[model samples]
Target: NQPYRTGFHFQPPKNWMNAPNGPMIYKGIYHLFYQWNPKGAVWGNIVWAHSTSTDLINWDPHPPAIFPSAPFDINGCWSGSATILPNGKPVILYTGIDPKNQQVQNIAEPKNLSDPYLREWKKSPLNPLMAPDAVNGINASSFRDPTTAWLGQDKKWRVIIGSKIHRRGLAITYTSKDFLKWEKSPEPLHYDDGSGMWECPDFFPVTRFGSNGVETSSFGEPNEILKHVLKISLDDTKHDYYTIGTYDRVKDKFVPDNGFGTAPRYDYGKYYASKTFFDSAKNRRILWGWTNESSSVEDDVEKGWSGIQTIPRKIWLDRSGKQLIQWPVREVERLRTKQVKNLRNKVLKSGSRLEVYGVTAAQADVEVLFKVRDLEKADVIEPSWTDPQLICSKMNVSVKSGLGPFGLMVLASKNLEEYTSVYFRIFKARQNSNKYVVLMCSDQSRSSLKEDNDKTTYGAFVDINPHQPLSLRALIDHSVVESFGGKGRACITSRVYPKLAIGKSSHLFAFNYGYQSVDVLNLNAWSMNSAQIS
Candidate 1:
């Protein structure tokens, strides 16, 4: 087990940047637009800040894409999606807040400024295409964010706006053939009873994979997944829901068995507002979300920063045949420039590790594979499996056999400021699982997987067998760490802030200690004293 040392990276410059919006791969270029607030690190009038890339690994920040200037959008321009028009121009469909009194509407574009290359998107003379209806609409000020995409066969545009129908927080759809006028679709999603306002509505086409891994579809409609990234806030309650599901065109709604809107897979804890874009190059749906609020996240502020967006994740169906398998996008793999690719038989004596990169952090991703050679349960050959897993209360911790008395620790500083990745106690004696595996809990709900120690914040679990022949993949981004124990199942998703000298401190290593050995991977060289985790 390697204790992840700190100072190998830096977080992004912060003011306020949330869910990645309008992520589109166009003409060999990757564009990422995010909810942006340029004021003083506060969430204010939102706009779309543009940034571009080729490999999705390295990025070049571009000019702002959409600014709040329209009277209808006086409040802000929130999260939305982008697609290319038949005319080869990028079409942006977004949420517009009419600040006169916090009214929400759908905003679109006809011309993208004079220099489309500059991305100065000019909203349609048709300012607010659609907004809160006559009477029983969503809480006037509580609505925003529209996820739009073209539906097949119909050759018409379907827009799903974050809204409320029949008092139920939902995603209301509007149909239009010319991308202008629209008619509301029936079948309003009934949000949970105490449901907060649902934001960021996503409706897209998806095909169903029959019981077998062969056929794309067999039943009726393509299982188009509908995901809603929203947070329901109350005085004593602040909960979030990001739902992924199958939308039935015929029913004009989605049937979710678990998530927020009508799906099953959801994130655990407070992380919310995750809007995703599909990247066909990687054959995945990737989204970005803020770690949390700046002040609510004291770590970033203490470091003189504010936030960062969760790394783009490549998501798909897990082998269980249900649930989601979300891994950091492969393009991120480019950051692991050096290191033995097939690190089979890698030995760790006394807390040993291999370090290869440094981070100033405007953004970076570290993907590594750890293989436990021999953790001689010898007293402590044995990593301390007894240490409490971060997310649980009274969980079991024993690496008595099979493979992994191993785990990873994130040493944020010499001060022991860090987080430890789960002590993967796999059944095979390897180290990725053997921990809690609850898809969703219920202090919360009512289910128990003693083997998983009662720790689950997602839906349906996929087996990423830690002790198997496969290697565990851990993705360390600016502020989030997604660890795929073996195959990408029941991932250990933890959030932490490492703010050393900002990046000047001498930290970064894998501390592996066993009764007979300890090894260290020196990453002290990865930093530019000028570089900080901030």
Candidate 2:
């Protein structure tokens, strides 16, 4: 048994898994399929491996649901999604690699809907439903990942297929009447020049204020205050980005609020190929993303596994309506057993530490609220500090700060030789305003004593006022560190192969390594129990 195996994150028993596909709720069960390789720890021999859960936390693995069988998908079956028909049957649209190695879209249906888990599927006799048409001007090799179809106001079903033309990323729209024959729309629902190839594209509606999520087919009225989100996995940067915009049914297009400005991300870390589905059972929207390893392939082969999916996060638009917020689904709380530690109003002097004992620090859930002593000592926001990630990389945890560079030291050893720091820093506003800006960061610089693994630091500008007590919740597994800042306004998940911080040797601490004093308003940590994934 590998000591680096995860205790709470969603992972298969062995081999490689990536790019969540066709996540859906059917017959009171949550079904998930993903890009899986049957042979080794690296990506090859790919297929859509299936699993189901009554709750999002636990799963029962099924046989490979859809592999290469027909001539259309003889090469391989790639990533795609599922759409439930109005009549209660579910259908899947996916990418297939043909003999020519050209990427195309195909369809599949459940062989028998009576199965509660929907374990078996069959490809259409008329396979390769959406091949690259020579006259369509779509690049054959670049087109892939068709999204879940939704019924529009005009009674026809519409869906987007991710593609590229030159450097422009496209969400190519296609419409159908009976869900079989299709016709491409004149233009894409949206396109961004120089954005690169979009992969695993997802589109859905979200409520403006609360955590409620709307179904893909629930096309609210234009004046209903509902906003649609279009998320795309960018090939150039290997990260996912989204924009809040208005969906025009008449024009059949999506217009971003600011098309040319910096786009917001679902995550700024290693999470990508994410997909979201409406949960009618709970009446919410849930998201899942793949977290790739930062270690070498040789290391992954030795461990007999490669990738793991982040916790299923319930996602919704924030009150600002400019960005989305996500937190782990409530059902996951069932795994938290035996509250191990708690802290309240524990003041911390600069360069001091407070250890949280009695928990298995290697596999724990920690939530802490930090209150800075005063705002006067906070650093001033530089005029050129628009890139939060860059700023955090240069000014890391080691950099002395008047008010911050403080939070938690997770997955650490006794000597503090190895640890991942999830903390926040504050800066004064640039334009002479009294307000301050909050920057959330997950610094993995010293996460491991080994020298081979990646330790890139990730950061995002939090939208909260610095005067408010900053909050952080971190889920520390054996080898993965998932941190949620400001109640999921920003999230960063990293894979760290800690040489000395595995198992019982790991320790947890709350530290204020700044020049100013900070108070711990409250801290609650639980030793998490393992989830069943059979």
Candidate 3:
């Protein structure tokens, strides 16, 4: 058995995979298409690999849906989005590298709509529906990854492709009367100077009051309360960033409440090329992202796989409406088998550790609520420490603090030789001030025994009141640890390869290494069973 293979996370049987693309629901079946490399565990021979599920937990694999075929895509088939027309027909617009290596947009439809799975697909005869041109001043190499097409009030379909000019990243807008034969807009949808190329851009709308998803085509009435979201994966940084804003339909522009580069991210670590779709069957929006391997290329080839899709998250606007909130989908709980309860209302003294038994340590779901009894003992936050990651690196799990650096030690060896610390550190704004800053971190510095692995520590300044109990959840697969802090206000995903903590040899524990004690309001852990993927 492979030690690093995950139990519940979605992954193909073998080889390389990246970018969750064109996820949608039709005929009560959830379809997920992703980028796959068939020949080896490297980044070539790309195709659109297809999979389907009824509950989103178990998956049934299908053959490659789209491959390099015509001249438009003879070089490669890259990432794209799916749009269901008014007539209930689903169409996919994807980026295809042509003979000259120029990226162009092409369309594909199911060969047989009667087939529930939509197993067979046919490309449009008029391929390369949209291509870069000197007349439009579009950069061929930088243009790709179109968003889901939306229907405007004028009865035309609108879509945007990620591109950049010089150093400014932006989304170039295009409109079509019939889903083909497009016309370019006079201006780019949105742009940020010196941000580099924006990849896999996603534009969607969310309601103001609740988490229910608004359809991509639905641009509410003039007086309706709704906010739009524009997300882009930065090619330079390999991180996904988003902004909550208003969609100006008349001018075909996006105005963000906060600009890009300064706004919040979908995730803080190891997540990229993320895509979101409105799940009509469940009346919610679902997000899927690619988590690349932290191991070196040599180790990835040895393992025979390179990437995995992060557990699909239910995404929505927070109550404050400043940023988005994300949590594992409710259906993932179906894999929870054995439970460990009895750790509730327990006080974890400073430098004390409690082992959590009765669950598979390597593959488990653990959630805990921590109550800070002595917030007055928290250390003061320095005004110069604006970067949370740098702060986390300096004040890691090994460094003792006045208040925190406490939470869970996941995928640890019995003697604690290797462990990934998904913990939080508290910092008071200043002396005797009620205002506080919560720093959530996933420290991988001590995660593996192998020296070649990348053990970067990730952190984010979570926005929450210290008076309330802080909530944290960690989904520990074999090699990936996804942590959500402050009720999903912040997220950090880590990839670790432990030499000692593998499968049945792994262990889990609750830890408090600070100078002050904290109370555990509630702690729950469950062993996760392997999903029927493949």
Candidate 4:
């Protein structure tokens, strides 16, 4: 229970990372891949960066796993999912952003730039494995975001690519057993208004519950959230959508049983570019996403780096519903360093909050449990909620506003703690510019700290408050702190360099429980636990 006293560390070759794609438990190992722009500290030709871990905490970054090496994916091999082939090899079916074909083409004239993408023109190889099929309802032949899953009932691999149909976002299915060979099927699911294009569509069966939360003989009960496919959809703007339901193999379609949920599982303003991995060891699904701006090259260069992978979220359900109770993976405990000495609970007389004795090390990893009992209540405005929190407060905002009240405290090497937060700002809906943001981080005044897990300088724990209590955790390594706020919204994946652990004493604390304070947990106890291999 160490607090982030020292600071956070950066596990890197020092470029940029996003969306933990291709997370599969194969051959008894957990394989994780991410969308990376390796050329500089900015976005270039997107490729897949690989890493493997016995558990979630210790991430060993691997050499390039999937680059734009083949003709099918020349300009960029964007986001996608991983599936275990029949022969046990991991098959990566991703959106091949063709270098040539994406130019805005006219729908009436196949060669004319009618579709919106054709105007920009990022074409692909003639025979890209998962390129858009002209025969399908797709518009101007532009398509991307492929989610591949294995259907036990159909005994075939089903890949769903997110694309626009006559300008409408629809999921186009591609079926294959060999993993390499494929053919397009009709739409298994579609939204009325471009509701948001289906991006990173993941379909799988999950048991949210079992006997006392046990999903298998090896792990804890899951509480049964989704035993079917959970397809998450998104658009160029900041809005997102999802469809969780059953699929019919013979018909090559998905019948979403749960009508699309109006709200996202992790609905902070940010938390876009989501992906998940099926954890065979726990018989559960673990999803990760890029918690920053999902944008282009020029934008990334200005920021030094772009995007970050959310802390691994164990998708389960509360005892009562079918929705997911996404908490950081248990293995993240390995980031702890040393703990502080004493902590005591104290109730606030006015509007004071709780502060505990957390870690004081220059770098640390930590978790906290926050609970609120409706001590106070008030009405909030909807539009106000989508703005920044620091100012949104005057306009009547809620946790829903600016995403949620997830705070940050970055301790600099000079013994200064740089606190940044998005607890009161909505994700700005913008065009394809990478600067379009869902998070607002200001260093009180006179400071600017924004990098790019979309941001590594900041990370958040879940929620722990006086109102609705939640469990929060973070990974702080060498100025890199990964915090997991409520679900995954209002999160921070940013950084502050130079290991500013001043005065030979660094510690973290928590202020909750009506201002009750406690000593930060000593991470030194687990310092040797660099990475926990679950």
Per residue, candidate 3 scores C-alpha lDDT tens digits across 192-224 of 999999999999999888878888877677676
Q: In candidate 2, what are the lDDT values of residues 1-534, reduced to their tens digit?
A: 687889888888999988999999998999999999999999998999999999999999999999999778889999999999999899999999989888888999998889998888989889788888778878989989999899998899999999899899999999999899988999899998998999989999888867888988886765667888999999998999999988889999998877525988888788999999989998899999999999988899999999999999999999988899999999988888865688899989989999999998998899999987789998888899999889889997888877778889999989999998888888888875698889888888899988889889898988887678898999998988888988999988888888988899999999988899899999999999999985
lDDT score at residue 504, model 2, on the 0-100 scale: 93
> Could you give the candidate ranking by TM-score, starting with the highest?
2, 3, 1, 4
Q: Measured by C-alpha RMSD in angstroms, how accurate is candidate 4?
A: 10.7
For all predicted structures, in order, the TM-scores are 0.70, 0.98, 0.98, 0.67
Best by lDDT: 3
Model 1 residue runs over 4 Å out of place are 1-14, 110-118, 165-167, 189-191, 207-246, 257-270, 280-283, 293-304, 339-391, 395-405, 412-419, 426-462, 465-470, 477-480, 491-493, 498-534
Clashes in model 3: which pairs? Answer: none
Compose the digit string of candidate 1's lDDT tens values, residues 234-316. Answer: 21233334344555555556666452333333343334566566554555556555445312334333444454554566655
Model 1, TM vs. native: 0.70
Q: How do these models rank on lDDT, best leading? A: 3, 2, 1, 4
Better of 1 and 4 by TM-score: 1
Error of 1 at 54 (Å): 1.5
Model 2 misplaced stretches (Cα beyond 4 Å) = none
Off by over 4 Å in 4: 1-11, 97-99, 102-127, 177-181, 210-226, 239-243, 248-252, 256-261, 267-269, 293-304, 338-344, 353-358, 369-418, 421-534
On the 0 to 100 scale, the lDDT of residue 209 in model 4 is 52
In model 2, pairs of residues that clash are none
